[PDB]
Amino acid sequence: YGSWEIDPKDLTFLKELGTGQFGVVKYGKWRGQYDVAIKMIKEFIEEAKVMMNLSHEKLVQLYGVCTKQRPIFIITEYMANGCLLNYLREMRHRFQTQQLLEMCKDVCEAMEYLESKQFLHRDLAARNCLVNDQGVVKVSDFGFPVRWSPPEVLMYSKFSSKSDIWAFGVLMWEIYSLGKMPYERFTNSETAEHIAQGLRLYRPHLASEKVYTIMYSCWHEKADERPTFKILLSNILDVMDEE
Numbered sequence: 513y514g515s516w517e518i519d520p521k522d523l524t525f526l527k528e529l530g531t532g533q534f535g536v537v538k539y540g541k542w543r544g545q546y547d548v549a550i551k552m553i554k555e556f557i558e559e560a561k562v563m564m565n566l567s568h569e570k571l572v573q574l575y576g577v578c579t580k581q582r583p584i585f586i587i588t589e590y591m592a593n594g595c596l597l598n599y600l601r602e603m604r605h606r607f608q609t610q611q612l613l614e615m616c617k618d619v620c621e622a623m624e625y626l627e628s629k630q631f632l633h634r635d636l637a638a639r640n641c642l643v644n645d646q647g648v649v650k651v652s653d654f655g656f657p658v659r660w661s662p663p664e665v666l667m668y669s670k671f672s673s674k675s676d677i678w679a680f681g682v683l684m685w686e687i688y689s690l691g692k693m694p695y696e697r698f699t700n701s702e703t704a705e706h707i708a709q710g711l712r713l714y715r716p717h718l719a720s721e722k723v724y725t726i727m728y729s730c731w732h733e734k735a736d737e738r739p740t741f742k743i744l745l746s747n748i749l750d751v752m753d754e755e
């Protein structure tokens with residue numbers, strides 16, 4: 513794979529990171545200079561290939577792969593603050609609501625980019641975003657989530673740009689509720705029934721009525737009445753200016 517093939521001996525491994533959703537992820541350095549995360553998989557056909565064609569400041573950036581050797585490596589930029597869901601549940605951060613809104617805006621920018629590329633993420637949720645050292649949120653794992661799915665997906669499997677819009681609204685709720693599970697008091701069956709009847713996530717305490725109006729707009733029962741990510745972006749930026 514061209515300049516995407518990385519020389520494994522340009523890699524050092526500095527610390528262990530996980531095994532519970534991946535296959536060993538490690539923090540290491542590339543070319544003695546760049547912090548990377550290194551994903552070692554085992555017996556890929558699609559993940560890096562997706563990641564080779566997409567590039568945005570708000571999408572976790574592929575640096576390269578190791579394909580000519582043992583277990584395959586995928587190497588990306590390193591996200592020092594880990595998954596967004598864990599970051600939000602860490603109470604020491606004591607976030608201000610302007611920080612929470614900026615997290616929404618980060619993800620919204622990534623999704624507007626993907627939308628412009630006609631690419632559907634399909635599993636957008638806080639667990640699939642990561643956070644770097646500066647607190648910037650980036651969309652990840654883009655290479656069944658009942659609580660992030662609109663009625664047309666639960667009932668008919670009708671995926672579309674508007675089903676990513678729905679999940680993004682639920683992701684804003686996850687941010688403003690500091691990492692709560694959506695529909696925390698319900699089973700998956702109950703969530704599906706209750707969403708099909710028109711009930712929606714309540715306004716988080718930290719979300720202003722303007723912010724809640726944005727997330728609520730993602731949840732129109734008619735998919736074609738939901739905004740695009742371009743419109744959600746402009747709306748979020750408007751709220752940031754109003755403060």
Ligand SMILES: Cc1nc(Nc2ncc(C(=O)Nc3c(C)cccc3Cl)s2)cc(N2CCN(CCO)CC2)n1
Nearest residue numbers: 529530549550551572586588590591592593594652653
């Ligand atoms: C599991 C984990 N990842 C971290 N950072 C990452 N950056 C990049 C990663 C990654 O997976 N990229 C990637 C992708 C997206 C696709 C294909 C291939 C790859 Cl390689 S994972 C940080 C972290 N921390 C846990 C503990 N911490 C405080 C909480 O206690 C902060 C440090 N934990």
